[PDB]
Design an enzyme around this catalytic site. Structure first.
Site, mmCIF file in Angstrom:
data_model
loop_
_atom_site.group_PDB
_atom_site.id
_atom_site.type_symbol
_atom_site.label_atom_id
_atom_site.label_comp_id
_atom_site.label_asym_id
_atom_site.label_seq_id
_atom_site.Cartn_x
_atom_site.Cartn_y
_atom_site.Cartn_z
ATOM 1 N N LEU A 273 -6.775 -2.131 4.517
ATOM 2 C CA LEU A 273 -7.021 -0.797 4.896
ATOM 3 C C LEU A 273 -7.507 0.207 3.982
ATOM 4 O O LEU A 273 -8.061 0.995 4.363
ATOM 5 C CB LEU A 273 -5.631 -0.557 5.757
ATOM 6 C CG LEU A 273 -5.092 -1.263 6.822
ATOM 7 C CD1 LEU A 273 -4.189 -0.529 7.638
ATOM 8 C CD2 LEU A 273 -6.253 -1.813 7.938
ATOM 9 N N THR B 138 -4.585 -3.919 -3.229
ATOM 10 C CA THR B 138 -6.059 -3.441 -3.857
ATOM 11 C C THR B 138 -5.922 -2.308 -4.610
ATOM 12 O O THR B 138 -4.928 -1.680 -4.306
ATOM 13 C CB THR B 138 -7.042 -3.372 -2.826
ATOM 14 O OG1 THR B 138 -6.855 -2.353 -1.741
ATOM 15 C CG2 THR B 138 -7.334 -4.578 -2.153
ATOM 16 N N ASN C 47 0.854 -1.230 0.040
ATOM 17 C CA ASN C 47 -0.155 0.057 0.159
ATOM 18 C C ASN C 47 0.811 1.210 0.021
ATOM 19 O O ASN C 47 2.262 1.251 0.060
ATOM 20 C CB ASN C 47 -1.170 -0.015 1.164
ATOM 21 C CG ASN C 47 -0.303 -0.414 2.357
ATOM 22 O OD1 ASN C 47 0.637 0.073 2.970
ATOM 23 N ND2 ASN C 47 -1.137 -1.438 3.236
ATOM 24 N N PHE C 48 0.230 2.354 0.106
ATOM 25 C CA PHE C 48 0.703 3.511 0.126
ATOM 26 C C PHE C 48 1.936 3.898 -1.161
ATOM 27 O O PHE C 48 2.978 4.670 -0.871
ATOM 28 C CB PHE C 48 1.258 3.920 1.414
ATOM 29 C CG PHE C 48 0.737 3.762 2.715
ATOM 30 C CD1 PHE C 48 -0.347 4.635 2.864
ATOM 31 C CD2 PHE C 48 0.378 2.672 3.541
ATOM 32 C CE1 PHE C 48 -1.133 4.646 3.915
ATOM 33 C CE2 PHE C 48 -0.129 2.524 4.681
ATOM 34 C CZ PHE C 48 -1.151 3.738 4.781
ATOM 35 N N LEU C 49 1.393 3.188 -2.274
ATOM 36 C CA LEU C 49 2.232 3.616 -3.275
ATOM 37 C C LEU C 49 1.811 4.989 -3.590
ATOM 38 O O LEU C 49 0.705 5.372 -3.619
ATOM 39 C CB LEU C 49 1.741 2.798 -4.754
ATOM 40 C CG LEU C 49 2.126 3.437 -5.896
ATOM 41 C CD1 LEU C 49 3.864 3.360 -6.126
ATOM 42 C CD2 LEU C 49 1.621 2.583 -7.172
ATOM 43 N N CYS C 50 3.037 5.815 -3.555
ATOM 44 C CA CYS C 50 2.539 7.280 -3.988
ATOM 45 C C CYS C 50 3.925 8.110 -4.412
ATOM 46 O O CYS C 50 4.861 7.905 -4.102
ATOM 47 C CB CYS C 50 2.228 7.783 -2.795
ATOM 48 S SG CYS C 50 1.971 9.667 -2.771
#
Ligand SMILES: CCCCCCCCCCCCCC(=O)CSCCNC(=O)CCNC(=O)[C@@H](O)C(C)(C)COP(=O)(O)OP(=O)(O)OC[C@H]1O[C@@H](n2cnc3c(N)ncnc32)[C@H](O)[C@@H]1OP(=O)(O)O
Ligand SMILES: Cc1c(COc2ccc(F)c(F)c2F)oc2cccc(OCCCNCc3cccnc3)c12
Length: 396
Positions: free
Chosen positions: A396, A153, A117-120
């Site tokens: 999350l 996701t 997650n938190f790919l940014c």
């Protein structure tokens, strides 16, 4: 080979490069140390201003340092899976991608994976194809530690989703949601009437319901494993994960992120049910009256009633429990309660006045092929009791 699916590529960790690939000129790799408030706070800042999955939305997430800690330092976490990119000359953090370890069951098979997650990527650096470079580097780091699969996701459709679930929203403070432009006023209706329609009491109905304590961990761990084992794709919790993900720690946690309740049967004193939800606030971009929407997200839950295989009985038990989760979110001041069509959600969503949202979440597996799993929705993208048993994992 196998007619059941399995990995796409078999990896030898001893053949994986121990040095990363070169980045664009002017930039360098960084491993974030999230135990350092300064670096935590750099990550918070990049996500706050650049982590906008959909620029068309009227709200942006608002993170807390507590949500970040809860999300990224779960059991088994390693600092080297918190990957960043810095500008060499200014030191500024301009991209991130993070993973934490866990295990999931994918049909027959248990797998160690990271959840990604938190790919940014900072707006200044968009459209330089930095993404495949980030992905390839956290892959290399996982491979070297013996992890060759991942699950993630996204709100966008990418090659072969294993499943798709639709957003659902139950208003708790309807008038505020109407004022921030989330909810329209239906044809012929008035405010008073929508306020009355969405009203809930201030007391719960399930006997024996109380907040989860540390002494409950073992019994909830066991109920949750048996409950989740009813789904094709599910998360295989250890006892330490139940502790970290579900039990709020007030001495340790500045702002409560997770709410978990159990039902201790009054006659028997056995724990027979539990549910939980977490807090993630949204800033409202342009509004004269409100600055934020406080949203609770339905997380994991379980009930012994599921094991009588009586579907009708399961549905009634969940209507009662989830109605009390609404009441408890509302008492803790949440504005809206969000849920997906996974788990056994389609049994209660409609009856409890959750309304269909405009958005779908897709689940993906990296380096693994498996038959698709139903996401709780039918052809028309509406919830469907016959389309459950698929997705037993929440992200999350
Ligand atoms: C063994 C362990 C293995 C570990 C790794 C496993 C795989 C992980 C995959 C990543 C998982 C991300 C999950 C999340 O973080 C939740 S989803 C939260 C996602 N984050 C955000 O939305 C933050 C706000 N937006 C941005 O920062 C985003 O803009 C960006 C970083 C998502 C994309 O950055 P960019 O616009 O500069 O694009 P680009 O020039 O760098 O490259 C584009 C290619 O990347 C793939 N691209 C675009 N969006 C994508 C996405 N969401 N997910 C994946 N790929 C994407 C596309 O399919 C495309 O491909 P082509 O052009 O080649 O066809
Ligand atoms: C996202 C999302 C939405 C749309 O958002 C809102 C809708 C109404 C509101 F009042 C509100 F505040 C919303 F944010 O509705 C949902 C319903 C169910 C589940 C949802 O998202 C589950 C995945 C959430 N990931 C949050 C995340 C994780 C990592 C980093 N940043 C943010 C969502």
């Amino acid at each position: 080979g196998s007619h059941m699916g399995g990995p796409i590529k078999i990896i030898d960790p001893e053949k994986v490069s121990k040095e990363p690939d070169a980045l664009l000129e002017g930039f360098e790799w960084a491993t974030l140390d999230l135990t350092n408030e300064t670096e935590l706070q750099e990550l918070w800042d990049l996500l706050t201003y650049h982590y906008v999955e959909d620029d068309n939305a009227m709200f942006r997430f608002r993170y807390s340092q507590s949500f970040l800690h809860w999300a990224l330092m779960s059991p088994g976490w390693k600092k080297e899976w918190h990957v960043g990119v810095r500008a060499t000359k200014s030191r500024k953090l301009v991209a991130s991608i993070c993973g934490v370890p866990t295990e999931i069951n994918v049909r027959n098979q248990k797998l160690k994976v990271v959840e990604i997650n938190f790919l940014c990527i900072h707006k200044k650096l968009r459209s330089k194809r930095l993404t495949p470079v980030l992905i390839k580097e956290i892959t290399r780091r996982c491979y070297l530690n013996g992890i060759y699969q991942a699950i993630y996701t996204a709100g966008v459709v990418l090659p072969t989703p294993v499943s798709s679930c639709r957003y659902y929203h139950r208003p708790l403070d309807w008038l505020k949601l109407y004022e921030v432009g989330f909810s329209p006023l239906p044809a012929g209706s008035t405010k008073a009437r929508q306020i009355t329609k969405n009203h809930l009491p201030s007391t719960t109905s399930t006997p024996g319901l109380r907040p989860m304590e540390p002494k409950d961990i073992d019994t909830v761990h066991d109920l949750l494993q048996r409950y989740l084992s009813r789904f094709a794709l599910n998360q295989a919790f250890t006892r330490e994960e139940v502790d970290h993900w579900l039990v709020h720690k007030p001495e340790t946690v500045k702002e409560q992120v997770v709410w978990a309740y159990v039902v201790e049967d009054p006659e028997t004193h056995k724990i027979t049910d539990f549910f939980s939800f977490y807090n993630l606030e949204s800033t409202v971009i342009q509004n004269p009256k409100h600055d934020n929407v406080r949203a609770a997200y339905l997380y994991y839950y379980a009930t012994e009633t599921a094991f009588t295989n009586n579907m009708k009985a399961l549905k009634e038990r969940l209507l009662m429990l989830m109605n009390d989760a609404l009441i408890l979110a509302k008492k803790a001041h949440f504005d809206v309660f969000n849920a997906l069509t996974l788990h056994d959600n389609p049994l209660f969503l409609e009856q409890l006045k959750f309304g269909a949202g405009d958005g779908q979440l897709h689940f993906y597996l990296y380096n693994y092929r498996t038959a698709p799993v139903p996401g709780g929705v039918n052809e028309k993208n509406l919830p469907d009791e016959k389309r459950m048993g698929g997705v037993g994992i929440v992200m999350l």
